[PDB]
Amino acid sequence: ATLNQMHRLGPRKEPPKRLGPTEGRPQLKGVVLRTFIRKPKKPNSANRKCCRVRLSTGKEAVCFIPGEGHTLQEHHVVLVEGGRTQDLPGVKLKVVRGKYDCGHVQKK
Amino acid sequence: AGSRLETVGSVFSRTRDLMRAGVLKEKPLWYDIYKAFPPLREPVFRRPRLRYGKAKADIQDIFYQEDQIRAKFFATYGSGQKAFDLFNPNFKSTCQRFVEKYTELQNLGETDEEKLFVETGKALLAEGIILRRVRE
Amino acid sequence: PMKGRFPIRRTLQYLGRGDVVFKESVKIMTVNYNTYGELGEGARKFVFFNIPQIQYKNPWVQIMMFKNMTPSPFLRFYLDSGEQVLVDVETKSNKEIMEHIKKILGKKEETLREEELEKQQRFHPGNFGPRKYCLRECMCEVEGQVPCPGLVPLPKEMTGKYKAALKAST
Amino acid sequence: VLKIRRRKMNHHKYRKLVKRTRFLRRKVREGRLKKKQIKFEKDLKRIWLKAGLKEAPENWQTPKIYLKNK
RNA sequence: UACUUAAAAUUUAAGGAGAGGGUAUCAAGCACAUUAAAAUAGCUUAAGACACCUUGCCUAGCCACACCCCCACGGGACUCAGCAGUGAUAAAUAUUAAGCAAUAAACGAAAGUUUGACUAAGUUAUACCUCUUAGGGUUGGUAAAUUUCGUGCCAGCCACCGCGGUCAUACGAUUAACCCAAACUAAUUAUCUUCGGCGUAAAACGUGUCAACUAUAAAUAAAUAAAUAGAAUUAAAAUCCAACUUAUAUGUGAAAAUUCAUUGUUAGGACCUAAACUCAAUAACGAAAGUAAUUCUAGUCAUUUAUAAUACACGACAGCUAAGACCCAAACUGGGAUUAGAUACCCCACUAUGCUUAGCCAUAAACCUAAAUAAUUAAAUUUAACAAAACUAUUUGCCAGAGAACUACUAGCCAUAGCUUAAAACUCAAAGGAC
Ligand code: FES
Ligand SMILES: [K+]
Ligand SMILES: [K+]
Ligand SMILES: [K+]
Ligand SMILES: [K+]
Ligand SMILES: [Mg+2]
Ligand SMILES: [Mg+2]
Numbered sequence: 001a002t003l004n005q006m007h008r009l010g011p012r013k014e015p016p017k018r019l020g021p022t023e024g025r026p027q028l029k030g031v032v033l034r035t036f037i038r039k040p041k042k043p044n045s046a047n048r049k050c051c052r053v054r055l056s057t058g059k060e061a062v063c064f065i066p067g068e069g070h071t072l073q074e075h076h077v078v079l080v081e082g083g084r085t086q087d088l089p090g091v092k093l094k095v096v097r098g099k100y101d102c103g104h105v106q107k108k
Numbered sequence: 109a110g111s112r113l114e115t116v117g118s119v120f121s122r123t124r125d126l127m128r129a130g131v132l133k134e135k136p137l138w139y140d141i142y143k144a145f146p147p148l149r150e151p152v153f154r155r156p157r158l159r160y161g162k163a164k165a166d167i168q169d170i171f172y173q174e175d176q177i178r179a180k181f182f183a184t185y186g187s188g189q190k191a192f193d194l195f196n197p198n199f200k201s202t203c204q205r206f207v208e209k210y211t212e213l214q215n216l217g218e219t220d221e222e223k224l225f226v227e228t229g230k231a232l233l234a235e236g237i238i239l240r241r242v243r244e
Numbered sequence: 245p246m247k248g249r250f251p252i253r254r255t256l257q258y259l260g261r262g263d264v265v266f267k268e269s270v271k272i273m274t275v276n277y278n279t280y281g282e283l284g285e286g287a288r289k290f291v292f293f294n295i296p297q298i299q300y301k302n303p304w305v306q307i308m309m310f311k312n313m314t315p316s317p318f319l320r321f322y323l324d325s326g327e328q329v330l331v332d333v334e335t336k337s338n339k340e341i342m343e344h345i346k347k348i349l350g351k352k353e354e355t356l357r358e359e360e361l362e363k364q365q366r367f368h369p370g371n372f373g374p375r376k377y378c379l380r381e382c383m384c385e386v387e388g389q390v391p392c393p394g395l396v397p398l399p400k401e402m403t404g405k406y407k408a409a410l411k412a413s414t
Numbered sequence: 415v416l417k418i419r420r421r422k423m424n425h426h427k428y429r430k431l432v433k434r435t436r437f438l439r440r441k442v443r444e445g446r447l448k449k450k451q452i453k454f455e456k457d458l459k460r461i462w463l464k465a466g467l468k469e470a471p472e473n474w475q476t477p478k479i480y481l482k483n484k
Numbered sequence: 485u486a487c488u489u490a491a492a493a494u495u496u497a498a499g500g501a502g503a504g505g506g507u508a509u510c511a512a513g514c515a516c517a518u519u520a521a522a523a524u525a526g527c528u529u530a531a532g533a534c535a536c537c538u539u540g541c542c543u544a545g546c547c548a549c550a551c552c553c554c555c556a557c558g559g560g561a562c563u564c565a566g567c568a569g570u571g572a573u574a575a576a577u578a579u580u581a582a583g584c585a586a587u588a589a590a591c592g593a594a595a596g597u598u599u600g601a602c603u604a605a606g607u608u609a610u611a612c613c614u615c616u617u618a619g620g621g622u623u624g625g626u627a628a629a630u631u632u633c634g635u636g637c638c639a640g641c642c643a644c645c646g647c648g649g650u651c652a653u654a655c656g657a658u659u660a661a662c663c664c665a666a667a668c669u670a671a672u673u674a675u676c677u678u679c680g681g682c683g684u685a686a687a688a689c690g691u692g693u694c695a696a697c698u699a700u701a702a703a704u705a706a707a708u709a710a711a712u713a714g715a716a717u718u719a720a721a722a723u724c725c726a727a728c729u730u731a732u733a734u735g736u737g738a739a740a741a742u743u744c745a746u747u748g749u750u751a752g753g754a755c756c757u758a759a760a761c762u763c764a765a766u767a768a769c770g771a772a773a774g775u776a777a778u779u780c781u782a783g784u785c786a787u788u789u790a791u792a793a794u795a796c797a798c799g800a801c802a803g804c805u806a807a808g809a810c811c812c813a814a815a816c817u818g819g820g821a822u823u824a825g826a827u828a829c830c831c832c833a834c835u836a837u838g839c840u841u842a843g844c845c846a847u848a849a850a851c852c853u854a855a856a857u858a859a860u861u862a863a864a865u866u867u868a869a870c871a872a873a874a875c876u877a878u879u880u881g882c883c884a885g886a887g888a889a890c891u892a893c894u895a896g897c898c899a900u901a902g903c904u905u906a907a908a909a910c911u912c913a914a915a916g917g918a919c
């Protein structure tokens with residue numbers, strides 16, 4: 001662009017930073033609604049443990065439960081955080097082990 | 109160990125540099141000679157480029173003043189029936205004698221080109237040279 | 245590569261090299277120059293090189309330039325008194341034009357120095373406060389004075405916590 | 415290569431979709447123009463009422479500019 | 485506070501050199517102006533008016549607010565956005581504390597009095613500092629650092645690339661090592677921001693003319709073979725009519741259907757529909773689209789140069805509307821064949837349409853996939869590669885990963901299954917270009 005065109009336009013227009021599943025918040029608290037399995041996209045082959053939750057914001061989201069084995073059930077309370085599950089499409093939240101009803105993976 | 113880079117510098121500059129670095133311990137025998145009696149131009153690589161737009165070379169077309177007279181002689185009489193001998197360094201052709209006489213008359217002060225052309229023909233006719241005014 | 249011709253003109257150092265600071269009387273400077281010709285070359289160079297420097301040091305002066313309106317280039321200054329100073333810059337180099345206007349309508353070095361000193365009258369080195377305005381925020385920074393408790397713990401006897409305990413003991 | 419094929423294949427699926435729902439789109443349009451006309455009339459009524467007139471200027475009838483006048 | 489009149493601090497009102505968030509799919513606002521006999525028809529606006537959305541900024545501090553109705557006569561849902569504290573809510577969690585001793589403020593002539601301002605404490609790894617215990621994470625690559633065993637595309641892991649189906653340095657335990665350390669790791673947010681590009685990758689967006697700026701500096705042009713419009717004209721080949729006339733004619737790879745109202749010949753007649761061989765191995769004209777049968781009439785031309793839309797005028801083909809034309813061609817349609825099927829390719833017939841007269845539509849790989857203009861050919865320039873050698877300057881337009889998307893919505897349009905304008909959600913770690 002010419003100096004006259006750069007002057008008439010100024011600095012580049014910047015698209016606003018749209019928020020993610022947590023809505024720009026470190027963590028959210030949600031109540032479990034269902035516990036189900038999600039299948040990772042090929043080539044990955046597994047039965048990943050996830051759950052649907054109703055967040056404090058009022059929306060409903062699908063959250064991956066990390067770790068080897070969870071005791072979560074319907075009506076339980078959990079603290080969800082950000083971080084997408086790469087193989088699981090649409091799963092943009094994860095549960096924090098050791099907070100509220102969810103507990104640390106049971107080393108056995 | 110050497111500098112086989114013939115596109116950077118010259119044989120002399122690369123030899124000077126290699127000795128400064130410490131890789132070449134003995135001077136080549138041709139080195140001192142080049143230092144004392146170098147060439148006029150430094151032999152450095154240059155990529156020949158083409159000329160573009162209105163760039164032109166600077167070569168003078170070699171045209172002497174005799175050529176104006178010689179052109180008329182070839183158009184009027186052609187080349188002399190006697191054959192050119194280009195091995196004799198002092199050869200005088202029929203056309204060169206025409207130009208020598210044409211010059212002599214012009215030194216006298218004749219200003220008309222037509223006068224100098226027909227008078228020279230008459231003088232050579234007296235000399236006995238066979239000039240044929242071949243229009244063909 | 246910076247765009248345009250002579251990109252050095254678009255640097256703060258170049259703009260600050262200008263030495264023509266007009267007197268308070270100067271209010272407008274009209275520049276009449278021709279884009280084609282031979283006797284107006286200095287005028288064209290003055291618009292190209294010097295007008296930015298003049299505006300930088302005289303932000304409140306209106307510089308308005310008109311092109312190819314007259315046979316010859318000239319400068320006309322409009323003063324606050326109502327006087328109009330015409331300058332003829334034909335056959336004059338851009339450097340010559342700057343020196344001429346500096347002489348007739350430019351502040352002298354003495355006047356400018358006095359203004360600079362007066363501007364800084366209220367800054368005192370001894371004054372304490374934020375870094376933006378002062379050298380030192382607190383007297384603890386000074387050598388020999390009691391250091392800040394945050395950096396160096398105070399003696400117990402100089403602390404209100406300790407003094408209160410003794411008063412209770414009394 | 416695949417970018418014109420995709421424009422072609424995308425454009426092919428739009429023309430098919432428009433054909434399947436051509437009659438629905440016609441009724442959508444006639445209603446969007448009617449709302450477009452009412453919005454035009456109301457915007458003109460706002461002007462004279464704000465100016466203080468209690469009736470539209472004498473001999474004025476809002477032109478119907480979105481109807482099948484041509 | 486001084487004088488009985490002058491220095492300040494502090495405000496208020498009216499203003500304006502300049503600077504000042506986002507959306508132009510917010511493009512018009514609709515009285516927003518001047519004059520001062522009260523007339524004139526003006527005022528702001530692509531140099532961004534108007535509308536809407538969002539946000540405290542100008543930081544020794546400033547501005548706005550003080551339960552709500554912008555305000556607070558009035559009304560209402562009737563007061564901690566003072567300190568401490570409580571309920572609810574939230575990922576978010578300080579004492580219902582002491583003293584007016586210091587400084588500040590209020591009051592008093594004053595000794596003095598008052599103050600949840602403030603001061604000294606309490607609470608909390610949130611930070612810094614000084615010390616003393618050591619814990620936290622990681623160990624496939626980026627990126628410092630793994631031994632044994634279990635698991636076997638399962639269980640699990642990853643910021644990106646990826647790992648796991650029997651020798652897993654990548655998962656789990658264990659061993660050691662690495663990093664940091666009263667912290668450590670995770671999540672969230674923040675700090676980095678246009679002088680780069682536009683033949684082939686995002687992007688010169690069909691064509692030209694008129695403005696204002698920004699640049700530039702010269703006083704010419706035209707006289708051109710197929711620009712364009714009108715009128716007149718016609719050579720070859722068809723069509724029609726007529727004479728004579730084979731028995732067939734037509735059609736394919738091969739056949740069938742079609743046909744004998746055909747066929748062939750005509751130095752017979754009519755027609756003037758449609759298209760313009762050779763020239764053309766040419767490279768002209770026009771802004772582009774486009775334009776080459778002949779003749780005649782009208783006709784292209786000077787603005788220094790570049791630079792234009794919200795205006796004006798054009799814009800292949802196909803398509804729409806109305807009245808005509810119709811040799812030939814030909815979507816569609818029917819017939820014949822072909823094939824497992826033919827909804828095609830091949831054959832026959834025939835229509836819209838191609839033509840004219842009036843409008844409309846405004847679309848192309850509208851492409852030389854090259855914006856225009858003036859330079860230079862050397863700057864030790866294959867500055868990727870391939871195209872079309874490279875490159876400087878000027879002005880405008882345009883571009884900012886891919887898909888979603890020649891889409892949705894918006895506005896304009898003779899357009900109504902239309903064109904121009906043109907997003908987001910969401911998804912992926914690529915997409916793409918040249919070799
Ligand atoms: S900053 Fe000076 S005493 Fe703390
Ligand atoms: K896999
Ligand atoms: K209020
Ligand atoms: K006190
Ligand atoms: K381990
Ligand atoms: Mg929209
Ligand atoms: Mg309240």
Ligand SMILES: [Mg+2]
Nearest residue numbers: 549550555556
């Ligand atoms: Mg109020």
Ligand SMILES: [Mg+2]
Nearest residue numbers: 564567568569
């Ligand atoms: Mg409180």
Ligand SMILES: [Mg+2]
Nearest residue numbers: 550563564566
């Ligand atoms: Mg109160």
Ligand SMILES: [Mg+2]
Nearest residue numbers: 576577608610
């Ligand atoms: Mg906190």
Ligand SMILES: [Mg+2]
Nearest residue numbers: 590591592593
């Ligand atoms: Mg007092």
Ligand SMILES: [Mg+2]
Nearest residue numbers: 634650651652
């Ligand atoms: Mg193993």
Ligand SMILES: [Mg+2]
Nearest residue numbers: 623624642654
């Ligand atoms: Mg790892």
Ligand SMILES: [Mg+2]
Nearest residue numbers: 630654655656
């Ligand atoms: Mg491991």
Ligand SMILES: [Mg+2]
Nearest residue numbers: 685686687853
């Ligand atoms: Mg492109």
Ligand SMILES: [Mg+2]
Nearest residue numbers: 689690847848
């Ligand atoms: Mg187009």
Ligand SMILES: [Mg+2]
Nearest residue numbers: 756757758839
């Ligand atoms: Mg005709």
Ligand SMILES: [Mg+2]
Nearest residue numbers: 780781782783
């Ligand atoms: Mg004529």
Ligand SMILES: [Mg+2]
Nearest residue numbers: 810835836837
């Ligand atoms: Mg027809």
Ligand SMILES: [Mg+2]
Nearest residue numbers: 849851852853
């Ligand atoms: Mg092309």
Ligand SMILES: [Mg+2]
Nearest residue numbers: 425847890903
């Ligand atoms: Mg299209």
Ligand SMILES: [Mg+2]
Nearest residue numbers: 428890891903
């Ligand atoms: Mg569309």
